[PDB]
Design a binder for this molecule. Structure first.
Ligand SMILES: [Cu+2]
Lengths: 224, 225
């Protein structure tokens, strides 16, 4: 099955993130399912190394855009699915306003029946008493627009957006995302006209779970 | 139950895995082979699974298992490395290549079943594009060095310092200053050594049957002094 064919039903997901922020090292594993026909994810993440040194919401965008719902008239613009099963590399720079920066590199691809997202994350120049290392971010998420454009030279796409993180004092912590994706195989892909992804996400907990963790529900639809 | 030196009485299988990123160039190296700490000997083969390395093989040598150093009878009480096993230790370094970039490394060295494993993550920053490393101007060989070890009583570990001498193709020598710190992974007691050193000698060769970018390594190390 190739491209969009791999997403004609519920697909199991494995996510693994190795992170290092200001020298603080942690690992997160996530598992669950995605249904691209309706643009839906259901995931549970565990911090296997103990309590995270950063707030869970700062990791959400790093922790599978192939599961976005692309309506039929837009299927010709679905770079993410078109790269499957071989997959794509996803890199970002994330600038937390008045604070540090995340640099991330990931491979998103099928390993057998499972869609896997393996990530390496760096965090630099974070303030010890800032919102991130100070854990002042609310455990929730907001709704965003992800702008996507083609990158013909690299046979891929670029994306940019700003995440809004609610701070415990009512303020909002912005995080500017700059994104590049490039196919792993060689490996023809869909190169899209400009469009966007509309995102909505809920962060919850598992009442039976004692480990530091995050339950995530996400709905994303392509438009424009 | 097999613990400390006891786990080095014979020839031990070794697995080494290095994930590297130098000036944005990414690579992965796996090595397999054997070590015999009674005579201080390593015999190892490394493969670059990601293709041609962006840096010379000799620059990775020190990163790619000091528990296999031969500690003579009078020195056994200074052997921090073996005493930490099987749970193992974290080994961290900063390596400054003079007039060039820097390696930052963090590794876990420990037993996994019967195998001694060395798992490493490496960052390289500020390297010059036309320098000895990114320019691949280093000879495929190695020299003999002295690794100075000192105890770190506060952290229940050890610190080390030394300078590697890398032969350059033009007859010059590229120095690489190593700064090293090791801390036990487990909560058991360990040996904290007096000041001493390790005397190192290493040969780099090739496997005439091997098509992949690779390095065969032969190493002898003895503690002294
Ligand atoms: Cu890294």
């Amino acid at each position: 099955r190739k491209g969009e064919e791999l997403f004609t039903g519920v697909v199991p997901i494995l996510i693994e993130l190795d992170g290092d922020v200001n020298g603080h090292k942690f690992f997160v594993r996530g598992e669950g399912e995605g249904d691209a026909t309706i643009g839906k994810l259901s995931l549970k993440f565990i911090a296997t190394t103990g309590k995270l040194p950063v707030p869970w919401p700062t990791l959400v965008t790093t922790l599978v855009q192939a599961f976005s719902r692309y309506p039929d008239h837009m299927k010709r613009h679905d770079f993410f699915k078109s790269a499957m099963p071989e997959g794509y590399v996803q890199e970002r720079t994330i600038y937390f306003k008045d604070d540090g920066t995340y640099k991330t590199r990931a491979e998103v691809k099928f390993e057998g029946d499972t869609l896997v997202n393996r990530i390496h994350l760096h965090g630099i120049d974070f303030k010890e008493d800032g919102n991130i290392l100070g854990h002042k971010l609310e455990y929730n998420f907001n709704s965003h627009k992800v702008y996507i454009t083609a990158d013909k030279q690299n046979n891929g796409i670029k994306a940019n957006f700003t995440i809004r993180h609610n701070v415990e004092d009512g303020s909002v912590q912005l995080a500017d995302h700059y994104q590049q994706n490039t196919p792993i195989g060689d490996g023809p892909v869909d190169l899209p006209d400009d469009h966007y992804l509309s995102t909505q996400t809920i962060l919850s907990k598992d009442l039976n779970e004692k480990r530091d963790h995050m339950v995530l529900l996400e709905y994303v639809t392509a438009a424009g």
